[PDB]
Amino acid sequence: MLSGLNHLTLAVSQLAPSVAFYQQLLGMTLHARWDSGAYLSCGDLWLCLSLDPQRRVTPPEESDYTHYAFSISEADFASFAARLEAAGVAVWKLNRSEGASHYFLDPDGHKLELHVGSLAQRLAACREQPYKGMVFF
Amino acid sequence: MLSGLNHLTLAVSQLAPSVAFYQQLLGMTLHARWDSGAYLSCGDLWLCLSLDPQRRVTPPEESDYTHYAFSISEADFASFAARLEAAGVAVWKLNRSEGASHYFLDPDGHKLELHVGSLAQRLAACREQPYKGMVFF
């Protein structure tokens, strides 16, 4: 059977600024870097940044809702979000439609999110404030 | 401080075939569905399918290398790949790197992968045979 996410690979247009974003700004751990990529971890997540000449810097109105959310604790959430804001990190969404979340963009316009809470906690919240037509299995 | 991947959200053009693909073909657990999305899990992975009229069914030549790899054991790899093949699921790349990998497309052209092997395994292989320009930290 499938047993989780083995890795997330993001295509990047400029490797050095992307490594700086994920390692310096977001605090992920850099394990290795080469001419065409980098390997980082964020807790158990294996993140690969892959230099791709096809990657375009994409404004958020031009891309669909596909996005990648990173876990953060309730105690750290607000100050991390505020630090990203003060650093000039672009955003893509304001309405909290799935709980406590901050929506921000990477240098290439990959849609990212800080989120507080597990799937179990989101299902429990949705039982009280369900999305239209929601059914639970 | 970020502690891991909280969730992966894929924009989908048609909810029913995407639910069938992830739940029935790929065996993920469906926890909830609503008029415009679904929540599934795959091991620790929280997957959200979000119905989005902006999602284009995208040929693999027209998207960049961004992709999502799921873990599977070596013992299960070949029969799962054969299941995808029987279902006519398209392949977007052949494997040329360490660890078994099967590169396949979802109904909207999201680039997926089955991979056997951890970051630690990849780093160990890279230390013995470093990529061009590779530096370790």
Ligand SMILES: CC(=O)Nc1cccc(CO)c1
């Ligand atoms: C600061 C840093 O880690 N620089 C670096 C590492 C590996 C390769 C290259 C050149 O592609 C630069």
Ligand SMILES: [Mn+2]
């Ligand atoms: Mn989200």
Ligand SMILES: [Mn+2]
């Ligand atoms: Mn991969």
